From a paper:
The de novo Kennedy pathway is the main route for the PC synthesis in P. falciparum and has been identified as a pharmacological target for the treatment of malaria. In contrast, the gene of PfCCT underwent a domain duplication event and thus encodes two catalytic and two membrane binding domains connected by a disordered interdomain segment. The enzyme forms a globular dimer with an α/β Rossmann fold that is well conserved in CCTs and other members of the cytidylyltransferase enzyme family.
Binding of CMP, a fragment of CTP substrate, to the free enzyme active site induces a major conformational change of R755 with a ~4 Å displacement to provide a cation-π stacking interaction with the cytosine group. In case of PfCCT, a flip of the non-conserved Q636 sidechain additionally provides space for the accommodation of the ribose. The nucleotide ligands CMP and CDPCho are anchored in the active site by several polar contacts, hydrogen bonds and a cation-π interaction of R755 with the cytosine ring.
Numbering used by the authors:
A (entry chain A), B (entry chain A): 616 to 712, 739 to 770
The structure:
């Protein structure tokens, strides 16, 4: 009955968009365990860009989110089949833009939706107006 | 056994300081219900200053916090004895600077600690440096 869901990301300056994504992932099935992977400072710098918050900060905030059952911090930058076996993960949940093609082929990918206009930085834009 | 705790505030741009306060309030006793009061846009404008986020936004974010059992939105600007009776509140939890003197006299005030340097706006200061 219980299904293990994995959602990875940077989760920098956690905002309502992230929280709604985690809620979505958590409620994909009736009984789930949501594991959240948080990306390292270095790989995030190397591949995405600057992070405002450190791994420790990004991880500590996530701990306070209702839908989060377990956190893997740091998590691998790229998901692998071996990683899924190690953590008994049934599905990977993430927005859908292919780096996830192999997960889709395996029937282990659950797409989630982004929430626009709600980021921490969009809120700063308000203040300046 | 179960104890009802009430924590009120603005909770604008929710950050780790708020989340740690709510965790503190929630863990004041072994078995609690944490009710969170969120202040109205008008009274917050009148008495504190501008709020970035609306009541609806401030409330929606709080919903995603693990420690929150119930939300009263909007909540009264000032706590009264009648309000405590209506919601069967045992203790009010808030930082300690006296507007809370009457609660302290009644044995219904539990002080919580602020967390410094961790606000959403302090994180914006980082980016600019
Ligand atoms: N506005 C946003 C921003 C991110 N998200 C989701 O939060 C998760 C982590 O995103 P980041 O790695 O960009 O922090 C991803 O699944 C992403 O789709 C969202 O659903 N809405
Ligand atoms: N840095 C901060 C900011 C607020 N808080 C707490 O969060 C609650 C709500 O604070 P505000 O009304 O300022 O949003 C209060 O109990 C306050 O003490 C905190 O513990 N640390």
């Amino acid at each position: 009955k219980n299904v293990v869901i994995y959602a990875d990301g940077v989760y920098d300056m956690l905002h309502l968009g992230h929280m709604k994504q985690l809620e979505q992932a958590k409620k994909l099935f009736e009984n789930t365990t949501l594991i959240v992977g948080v990306t390292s400072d270095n790989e995030t710098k190397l591949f995405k860009g600057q992070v405002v918050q450190t791994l420790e900060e990004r991880t500590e905030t996530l701990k306070h989110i209702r839908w989060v059952d377990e956190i893997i911090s740091p998590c691998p930058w790229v998901v692998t089949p071996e990683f899924l076996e190690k953590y008994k993960i049934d599905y990977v949940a993430h927005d859908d833009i292919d780096i996830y093609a192999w997960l889709k082929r395996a029937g282990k990918f659950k797409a989630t939706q982004r929430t626009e206009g709600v980021s921490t930085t969009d809120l700063i834009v308000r203040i300046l107006k």
